[PDB]
Design a binder for this molecule. Structure first.
Ligand SMILES: *C(=O)[C@@H](NC(=O)/C(=N\OC(C)(C)C(=O)O)c1csc(N)n1)[C@H](C)NC(=O)NS(=O)(=O)n1nc(C2=NC=C(O)C(=O)C2)n(CCCS(C)(=O)=O)c1=O
Length: 500
């Protein structure tokens, strides 16, 4: 006779979207265990027990003999109650069932990267499951038992500690927008023969992540083998050069300096600019005088570089750091990357120019979307959240409201003006944004923007990695994805059309 204490598993808390749609649900599973000391008295039952467990008779018999000095062995973990009851129905001495919890992900591949998953022990292993593990797990209980000399449970004496169930968690994700974003990103990858992609949707007023999808994705309900590339939450754990998508932040520094107005002109002829051994190069090289809006419409690296030389890189670095590029988001997502915003005590001319046009800095899609959200929210940055926000925290004014408003207007012209990124136009609304194309010849196609331009509600980033068709420019590849997903998101959120 021996007094022993055994655990009582806790029910893991439900994860829902922002409207209560289930995203991660704890399902009862049966764990079958056996006491090899008791099994030894019923050898004639072993072949039927092996057959029920789908094991070769001899391998099963060998396994029980090799573990003959033990009082506990796992037979099979995570069976369905129906399957466990079938083994229990054989009435084999020394065989026991135990109720365990296993996660089911009703939206499967659609929200796999954001939700993440639990391991074999029901502990958070990836995504939100890992980030909020303490909240979701609860606390296992403890049961007191009396065991005989073979280790067989003679009596259940008392519960010493009751199990405490885990707590419900409502994400910021809107499953309707998530499904729309998932489908359009998937379609774009196919249309462009692309390797990977990410799409982030943010509420500019609340800091909430309304959608976060990546390609390739995986079914978290069937994780048998399957590629590590498919499990990466790329929006948070992959870094890239943002390129021309950071030019609005360089422009914000220009307008805040007191030295530049949108109607000021920069001469970008002949479409290149030599700075020692380095040459700044424009894509289209048939311009001379461009105004500040024109520098963004034509995406002139030369133009933004000349502005950067005039105002100094310190002013540009400060805006980019303040909007969160290459900075910790504070989300604490597992494996989340910070990227890098290079710094210098004395900025050389080449580094000043490359900073201004987003070369040599590394950011995540989440960081880029957060920066555009600050710009869209009249220069005020609301802290990021992966959970439903009921009480909105105070934001930080990172760009002056007048400067943010002027840049917003310039970005609406990037989308709407003659020669602009027309594929980003959102039917029924005024939209604003900037595309980018980064050479990694392999490319990353980008679009970052927000809408409705008259009263912004949503910021969005579209990243398409290595499009393989003739078209690779961000304005061609990523801009139409932004248009479709933004139109859908605005409609789902009942945002009144502003292009009247
Ligand atoms: C910004 O992202 C800029 N990128 C770079 O300078 C980098 N690479 O440039 C390329 C050209 C890809 C290269 O060196 O091969 C870069 C930055 S960080 C890094 N590692 N590399 C470029 C200049 N800007 C854009 O791509 N802007 S954009 O996506 O809006 N875009 N530009 C164009 C073209 N404009 C003019 C031309 O003559 C062209 O041939 C392309 N486009 C396509 C037209 C779009 S439309 C019909 O006007 O809407 C586009 O989308």
């Amino acid at each position: 006779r021996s007094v022993r204490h055994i655990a009582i598993p806790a029910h893991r808390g439900l994860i829902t979207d922002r409207n209560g749609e289930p995203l991660a649900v704890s399902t009862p599973v049966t764990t079958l265990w056996a006491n090899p000391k008791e099994l030894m008295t019923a050898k004639e039952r072993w072949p039927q027990l092996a057959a029920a467990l789908g094991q070769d008779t001899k391998l099963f018999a060998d396994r029980i003999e090799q573990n003959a000095e033990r009082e506990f062995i796992y037979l099979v973990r995570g069976l369905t109650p129906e399957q466990g009851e079938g083994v229990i129905a054989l009435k084999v001495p020394g065989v026991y069932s135990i109720e365990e919890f296993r996660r089911f992900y009703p939206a499967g591949e659609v929200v796999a990267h954001a939700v993440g998953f639990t391991d074999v022990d029901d502990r958070g292993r990836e995504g939100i499951e890992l980030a909020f593990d303490e909240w979701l797990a609860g606390v296992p209980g403890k049961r007191q038992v009396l065991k005989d000399r073979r280790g067989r449970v003679i009596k259940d004496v008392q519960v010493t500690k009751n199990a405490k169930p885990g707590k419900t968690l409502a994400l910021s994700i809107d499953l309707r927008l998530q499904y729309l974003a998932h489908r359009e990103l998937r379609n774009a990858l196919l249309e462009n023969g692309a390797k990977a992609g990410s799409l982030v949707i943010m509420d500019v007023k609340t800091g909430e992540i309304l959608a976060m999808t990546n390609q390739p994705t995986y079914n978290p309900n069937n994780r048998r083998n399957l590629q590590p590339a498919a499990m990466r939450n790329r929006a948070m754990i992959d870094v890239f050069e943002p390129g021309s998508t950071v030019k609005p932040f360089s422009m914000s520094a220009a307008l805040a300096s007191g030295r530049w107005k949108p109607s000021d002109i920069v001469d970008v002829y002949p479409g290149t600019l030599q700075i020692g051994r380095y040459t700044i190069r424009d894509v289209s090289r048939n311009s001379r005088q461009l105004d500040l809006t024109g520098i963004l419409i034509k995406s002139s690296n030369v133009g933004i570089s000349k502005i950067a030389f005039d105002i100094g890189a310190e002013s540009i670095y400060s805006v980019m750091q303040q909007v969160g590029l290459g900075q910790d988001t504070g989300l604490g997502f597992p494996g989340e990357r910070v990227g890098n915003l290079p710094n210098h005590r004395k900025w050389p001319k080449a580094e000043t120019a490359t900073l201004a046009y987003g070369y040599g800095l590394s950011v995540t899609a989440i960081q880029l979307a957060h920066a555009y959200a600050a710009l869209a929210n009249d220069g005020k940055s609301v802290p990021l959240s992966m959970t439903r926000v009921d009480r909105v925290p105070d934001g930080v004014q990172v760009i002056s409201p007048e400067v943010a408003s002027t840049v917003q207007g310039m970005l609406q012209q990037v989308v709407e003006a003659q020669g602009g990124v027309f594929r980003a136009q959102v039917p029924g609304y005024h939209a604003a944004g900037k595309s980018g194309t980064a050479r990694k010849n392999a490319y990353r196609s980008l679009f970052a923007g927000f809408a409705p331009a008259t009263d912004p509600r949503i910021a969005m980033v579209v990243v398409i990695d290595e499009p393989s068709k003739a078209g690779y420019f961000g304005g061609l590849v990523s801009a139409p994805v932004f248009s479709k997903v933004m139109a859908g998101a605005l409609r789902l959120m009942n945002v009144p059309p502003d292009n009247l």
